[PDB]
Structure formats: C-alpha cells, structure tokens
Amino acid sequence: QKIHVGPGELDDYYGFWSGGHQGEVRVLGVPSMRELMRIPVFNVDSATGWGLTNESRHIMGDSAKFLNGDCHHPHISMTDGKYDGKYLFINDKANSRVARIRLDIMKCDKMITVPNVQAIHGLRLQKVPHTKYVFANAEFIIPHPNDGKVFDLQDENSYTMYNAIDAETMEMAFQVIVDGNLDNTDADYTGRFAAATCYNSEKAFDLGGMMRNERDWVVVFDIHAVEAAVKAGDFITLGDSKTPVLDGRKKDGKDSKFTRYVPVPKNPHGCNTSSDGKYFIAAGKLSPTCSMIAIDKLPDLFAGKLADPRDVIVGEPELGLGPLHTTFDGRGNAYTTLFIDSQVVKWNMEEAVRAYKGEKVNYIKQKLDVHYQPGHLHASLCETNEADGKWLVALSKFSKDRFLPVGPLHPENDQLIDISGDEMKLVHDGPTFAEPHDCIMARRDQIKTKKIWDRNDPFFAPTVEMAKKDGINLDTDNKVIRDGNKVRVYMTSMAPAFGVQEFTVKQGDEVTVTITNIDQIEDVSNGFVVVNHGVSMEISPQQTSSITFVADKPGLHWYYCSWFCHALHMEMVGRMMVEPAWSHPQ
C-alpha cells in the first residue's frame, strides 16, 4: 500500500480533522496527511473574513459574539449506511453549538446554539434510512431553570439532556432528559436505537464523587418511541424554547418508554457501533475492558423480555489499561486505543463474545505501541457498512520527542497505521496543532466539490435580497448607495481591478462593502482589506461577499486585494475618502 504521494500524484482519501479548541475543521489528503484546506466554523478567520463578514455572522446568529470554539467529533451524512458526501457536522463544547458544513463548497452553512444545555460534546449521525437526525450530547448537569436560585446538582430539576437536531433544517427536533450525564454517542443500522455513555451517574461535581460508582452505564434510546410521543403531543417545553422535551429518567425504578440503562464500568468513554451493525461497543476507561451491547437484543430489552439490563451485554474483553475508543476494519476485528498503556490493541469481536460465554480463547491479535497516550482512533469508512480496512489514524495527546522542540506547547501526534494486512504497521507521524480529537476519512469519489459558486446559492442569498431593495443587479453594478449615515457600496471585482476604485463618506458613517467577483476562471479569488480598520474578506469566482465597518477616521484610507490574483496584484487597490466630522452637521 503506497505510503508517499509524490509531486503530481493525488491522495486517495479525504480526511476531515476536527480543529480541537482552535475551532475549525481541517481537510487533509490521506495518506500524505497534508492539510489541503481549513474550514472556519467557530474561530474568526482573518483570511476569508469568517466571523467578520455579514454572511458568516448571519449564519452564526447571536453566537457571532464568541471568538472561540472547541470541536471534537466530525461526521459525514449518510444514506442507507454509507456516506453520501452532502454534509459534515461537528460540535462546539465551549459555547454549546452544532455546525453543518456543506461539502460541495467546503464552508459552514448553518449553525445552532442548542437550547437549555451546557457543552455539546459527543455527536453522531443517524445511519439508516439516512441521516434524518444529528444526535448530540450535552455533557454537564445544570438546573432548570438556571436562574441562580438553585445550584444543587441533586435537585429534581437538575439534569442534562440528549439532543436531536433535524439535519436538513438544522433546527431542534427533540430533547430527552436523562439521569447522570452524557459523554459519547452512536447510532444503530436500523434507525430505531441510539446509545450514549455516561460517566457521572453520581451527579457529582468533584473528581472523587464522579468515580464513586463501580459501574455507570450506557443509556439506550428508542427513537421510534420518542417520535411517537412527539406526534402524540406528549412532551413539555423549557424556557422560551419550543423544542419538545421528553423525560427519559427512571422514576422510582420504573423505566421510561424512551430509555434503558445498561450498567457498564467505569466512567466509560467511547461509544462505537461496529460496522456490521451487531454491537454498541463502550470503552471502559477506568475499567480495563470494553463492554459489547448486542443490538439484536435491544427490542427484547425494551419489551421487558429480559430480566436484567446487563443481559444485553455479550462480551467484555479485557484489553489493557485505559481503553478510550474503538474502530473497525470490516473483517470482524476491532481496534481500541489504550491511553495509559499507550497502544492500539487489535482484537476479534466474535472470539471476545465466545470468551464471555466462558470458552477460553485469545481474542487479542496484536498490540502496537503509539507515541504517546492515544485518544480517538479511526479506520477508513469505519462508520459505514463499507468499512474497508485499509488505513487507521490514532490521535495521540503527548508527542514528547517525536518532533523537533517548539517550546513549552507541543503538537499532537496523529499516527497513520496500515491495517490492510493481519499486522498493523506504523507508517507516518503527523504533528497537529490544538488537539484534534477525532477525524473521519472518505474515499476521493465520495466527495464532489464545486469549483465556482452558483449565483442563487443560499450562502449569500440574504445579501442578494438586500441588493434588490436598493435596486442593485449584483452581476453588473458599481454603485454607491447613500442612506442617512449608512453607505452601501456595491461593486464587481475582476482581477486586477475593483469595480469601484474610490468613494467618499462622512466621518462616522456605517459603511457596507459588497463585492461580487464576476470572474469565470476557477481559482481566481479576490480579497478586500481596508487598511487599519480591521476589515478583511475573500471573494471567490461568482461569489458575493459583504462586510460592514464604521468609517471612524477622517482622511484617505486605502483598500487593497489581499489574494494574489494577477501579475498586477499589488495594483488592485482603491481609496476610501472620509470627510471630517467638523465639516458636517453636529
């Protein structure tokens, strides 16, 4: 299996890395592991203007006031258990958001702040019949309402919730109150069941408390029952949110219609569906095991045909110290990160299941040393029924001496491992910034991108509507619209010239500049920077982009095209002239 991609060759896979607490999504080529693109999501990007432009701030809504994010879990939309390459979704733990990225333009196109929760951590997508719902965990228990009268986590109204977002509209679909808390989550291959690990069944706030219980659990959700309850109008609502809220807590030992709690040790972390649809696999973390939940047994569990929730567990292989996450090669083998032992352990799920029945057999096939302290791992197409068993990436949190010293802050080490054969082979050390937690790979032919924008694209449709109110045709017009103390400049751009090369405003005017790049050649991006005003944005071919700033400085102020576009790039400039306040009224 070729490891190196030479000049003029292309990678075989796309890789979508989370940006960690840096807040972006990174697009890598695999197996070269080179970064092809950064997709700003929760960060402010000086280069494209994301978080400065009117289009981006409209997508972010009120959360445009935050300059930070913390993302962990990127996932690609599916149809019938296979990637369809339309959307990628990712969480924000820092400000409790979920974002959707459109894979054809590789931009964030929708974002939602999840109501009545703190900290979106785990996220995964419905697999079958297609990604109708995005499932997201809120990690921290809070009071409801959270108005500062009650702070106690033990109050009957202190809880966290499992969240379902409608993937196509990016509005809330429902929320399910749970006992304990939520960590990671996955979904079955039927659409009926989802599952999440919980580490704080104690509802404590201190370290000792959260480790008190021998087992926490994985909570299993019957989504068909939740939908049935929503259609029956049997739910409540919290605060000013109209999201249906259903109660999945145990009420004095009686289970909810919506949930069942399977005891699992101990502060379990990863929650992964095997690619054959047979198991939810929960990594035991503080327990040196994984727990294997038989998805075929869940209907019987929800029908009261099982005496004990543990009856749905059909294996608990002892793997090593600090199991965190599991992935699958599609040949019947599972691969699990051991954080403390600092290894990846390859094991055979069916032999694990036989050993739980007492049939002594060695289900452990190989342990590979990794460098050092691995968190997530991901095998190519592992989240689909097309898991192809070629590449594995283990994302390690301490790189120590694996790279040149760069000061007190070290890179993460994302290691590429060949699993096409019976023996795992470590082939590449990839340093990365800001702690990617997880990543997802797709075949080159599962992703189709646009090279030029459509003029009706929803990304800037609000800007086109604003232009219409001004009677502007964005494809041709170079006009300055004046409206009181507001000024709206509309121009075309066509390397190496701005369509409006000079305009005059009053000191204090609120200036919006809207640029439509009317080039036809792919790859001729234009930029727009206003010197010393904190204004920067990119405009690609056939895109309309706009940005608003206050002209608070009298005098002459240059603007220039930031993106190299032509041999005469450094001459694509213009002048804003600001008449002083003392020459105008007030």
- The residues that touch ligand CUA, with contacts defined as CB under 6 A, are 495-496, 526, 561, 563-566, 569, 572
Contact between 480 and a copy of itself by CB under 8 A: the answer reads no
Shortest Å, Cβ 106 to Na ion: 19
Tokens of 14: 């796309």
Element (H, E) at 90: strand 82-92
Contact between 38 and a copy of itself by CB under 8 A: the answer reads yes
Q: How far is CA 81 from CA 168, 382, 413, in A?
A: 17, 11, 30
467 touches 476 (CB < 8 A)? no
Interface pattern 415-454 for ligand CUZ (x via CB under 6 A): ----------------------xx----------------
Which residues are bridge partners to 366 per DSSP?
346
Contact between 350 and Cl ion by CB under 5 A: the answer reads no
Contact between 482 and a copy of itself by CB under 8 A: the answer reads no
Ranges within 268-297 binding ligand CUZ (CB under 6 A): 269
Shortest Å, Cβ 434 to ligand CUZ: 12
Burial of 67 (0-12, 13-18, 19+ CB in 10 A): exposed
Interface pattern 113-132 for ligand CUZ (x via CB under 6 A): --------x-----------
Q: Which residue is nearest to ligand CUZ (CB)?
A: 437
Nearest CA among 224, 453, 441 for reference residue 328: 441
Q: Tell me whether residue 49 or residue 270 sits nearer to Cl ion (CB atom).
A: 270
- Please confirm whether the linkage preceding 199 is cis (ω < 30° from 0): no
- The Cα 429–Cα 33 span in angstroms is 9
* 3-class secondary structure per residue, 95-108: CCEEEEEECCCCEE
Shortest Å, Cβ 25 to Na ion: 17
Q: Tell me whether residue 217 or residue 302 sits nearer to ligand CUZ (CB atom).
A: 217
Ranges within 247-276 binding Ca ion (CB under 5 A): 267
Q: Which does 216 bind (CB under 5 to 8 A by kind): Ca ion, ligand CUZ, a copy of itself, none?
A: Ca ion
Indicate which single residue of 24, 70, 139, 216 sits in contact with Ca ion (rule: CB under 5 A): 216
Indicate which single residue of 203, 376, 378, 390 sits in contact with ligand CUZ (rule: CB under 6 A): 376
- The Cα 364–Cα 376 span in angstroms is 19
Contact between 503 and a copy of itself by CB under 8 A: the answer reads no
Give the contacts of 264 (CB within 8 A, at least 6 positions apart).
197, 215, 216, 217, 218, 282, 284, 291, 313
Length of the chain: 586
Q: Which does 72 bind (CB under 5 to 8 A by kind): ligand CUZ, Cl ion, Ca ion, none?
A: ligand CUZ
Contact between 181 and Ca ion by CB under 5 A: the answer reads no
DSSP class per residue in 223-234: HHHHHHHHHTT-
- The Cα 236–Cα 227 span in angstroms is 14
Residues that bind K ion (CB under 5 A): 397
